[PDB]
Write an enzyme that holds these catalytic residues in place. Structure first.
Site, short mmCIF file in Angstrom:
data_model
loop_
_atom_site.label_atom_id
_atom_site.label_comp_id
_atom_site.label_asym_id
_atom_site.label_seq_id
_atom_site.Cartn_x
_atom_site.Cartn_y
_atom_site.Cartn_z
N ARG A 18 5.11 -1.77 12.92
CA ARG A 18 5.72 -1.00 12.07
C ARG A 18 5.82 0.29 12.69
O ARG A 18 6.89 0.92 12.79
CB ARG A 18 4.99 -1.03 10.83
CG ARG A 18 4.89 -2.31 10.09
CD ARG A 18 3.95 -2.38 8.92
NE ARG A 18 2.61 -2.01 9.52
CZ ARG A 18 1.65 -2.06 8.55
NH1 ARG A 18 1.68 -2.16 7.54
NH2 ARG A 18 0.16 -1.62 8.96
N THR A 76 1.70 3.37 5.61
CA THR A 76 2.10 1.87 5.95
C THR A 76 1.89 0.76 4.60
O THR A 76 1.03 1.46 3.53
CB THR A 76 1.35 1.10 6.89
OG1 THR A 76 -0.06 1.66 6.93
CG2 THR A 76 1.84 1.99 8.32
N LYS A 83 -0.06 3.37 -2.90
CA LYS A 83 -1.16 4.24 -2.83
C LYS A 83 -0.59 5.79 -3.10
O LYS A 83 -1.38 6.74 -3.68
CB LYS A 83 -1.83 4.43 -1.66
CG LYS A 83 -2.98 3.09 -1.76
CD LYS A 83 -3.85 3.11 -0.27
CE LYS A 83 -4.76 1.79 -0.31
NZ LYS A 83 -4.21 0.50 -0.21
N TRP A 100 1.76 -3.76 4.04
CA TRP A 100 1.75 -4.98 4.14
C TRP A 100 1.37 -5.82 3.18
O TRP A 100 0.29 -5.96 2.92
CB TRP A 100 1.17 -5.18 5.59
CG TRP A 100 1.33 -6.48 6.11
CD1 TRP A 100 2.06 -7.62 5.67
CD2 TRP A 100 1.12 -6.95 7.36
NE1 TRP A 100 2.10 -8.69 6.51
CE2 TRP A 100 1.39 -8.35 7.74
CE3 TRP A 100 0.43 -6.37 8.63
CZ2 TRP A 100 1.20 -8.97 8.78
CZ3 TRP A 100 0.13 -7.19 9.81
CH2 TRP A 100 0.65 -8.41 9.81
N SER A 113 -5.90 2.84 4.55
CA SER A 113 -5.27 1.79 3.59
C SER A 113 -6.49 0.99 2.92
O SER A 113 -6.27 -0.16 2.55
CB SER A 113 -4.32 0.93 4.02
OG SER A 113 -3.35 0.54 3.15
N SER A 159 0.72 -1.33 -0.05
CA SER A 159 -0.13 0.04 0.01
C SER A 159 0.77 1.44 -0.04
O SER A 159 0.38 2.58 -0.25
CB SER A 159 -0.91 -0.05 1.11
OG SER A 159 -1.96 -1.12 0.85
#
Length: 247
Positions: free
Chosen positions: A233, A191, A56, A193, A100, A53
């Protein structure tokens, strides 16, 4: 009979932060056009990983620059069961950034279309700049890959309005990335993942604006496992930035 003393510098401390989580990670820092590496797995800094992500950021830049959307557009939840109940609502690109919310950005990616997306990704030179034939998942399961150093370079350019997009578009995307403000500091970031590949990869890429305006960009990149909380994170990032006296 004087004992020895172990002297922890920030290099040793950040290395051990990742060791305590039983995983491999790197934290890339950029400021004043100088990059420093920290963590227990420095070779990750120049290894390509799927962006997840973090992409984005670039999806939004491309969609706004090419007038496929605007910052006030409300993307409607059309009724499919989403990965999280928190995503089951109408929301803007900015709210989807913070959440996200993958399906909002899949809708945007499909408006852009495979041809324009591939041309814009190559024009930017993001990572390996390869998106394949699947317009709705190329940042989640490949073939697009990028190194943590490339991510810190990209996000620092965004922070400085130096990417090859209009100034207003970059300013608008920056506004979507604000995570925290206190005591004259701002933290921006995104972030990521990638859960559906092996090994899984986790990201937190962004920058700190210090009270005097100085920009310190960061890209955290680590191997994830399913039992980890997503906030691992953020925890590793914040402790490391404090150790480095960035915040």
């Amino acid at each position: 009979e004087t004992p020895s003393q172990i002297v922890q510098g920030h290099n040793q401390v950040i290395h051990q932060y990742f060791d305590e989580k039983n995983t491999s990670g790197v934290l890339v820092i950029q400021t004043d056009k100088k990059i420093n590496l920290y963590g227990n797995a420095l070779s990750r800094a120049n290894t390509e990983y799927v962006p997840a992500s973090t992409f984005k950021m670039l999806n939004a830049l491309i969609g706004l620059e090419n007038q496929k959307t605007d910052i006030n557009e409300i993307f409607k939840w059309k009724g499919e069961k989403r990965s999280f109940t928190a995503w089951e609502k109408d929301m803007t690109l900015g709210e989807a950034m913070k959440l996200s919310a993958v399906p909002v950005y899949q809708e945007l990616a499909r408006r852009i279309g495979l041809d324009l997306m591939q041309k814009e990704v190559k024009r930017i030179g993001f990572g390996n700049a390869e998106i394949g034939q699947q317009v709705d998942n190329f940042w989640l399961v490949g073939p697009l890959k990028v190194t943590p150093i490339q991510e810190v370079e990209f996000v620092s350019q965004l922070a400085h309005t130096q990417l090859p997009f209009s100034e207003k578009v970059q300013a608008n995307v920056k506004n979507m990335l604000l995570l925290e403000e206190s005591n004259g500091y701002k933290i921006f970031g995104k972030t990521g993942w990638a859960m559906d590949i092996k090994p899984q990869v986790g990201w937190l890429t962004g920058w700190v604006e210090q009270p005097d305006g100085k920009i310190v960009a960061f890209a955290l990149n680590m191997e994830m496992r399913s039992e980890m909380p997503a906030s691992i994170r953020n925890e590793l990032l914040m402790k490391s930035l404090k150790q480095l006296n960035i915040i």
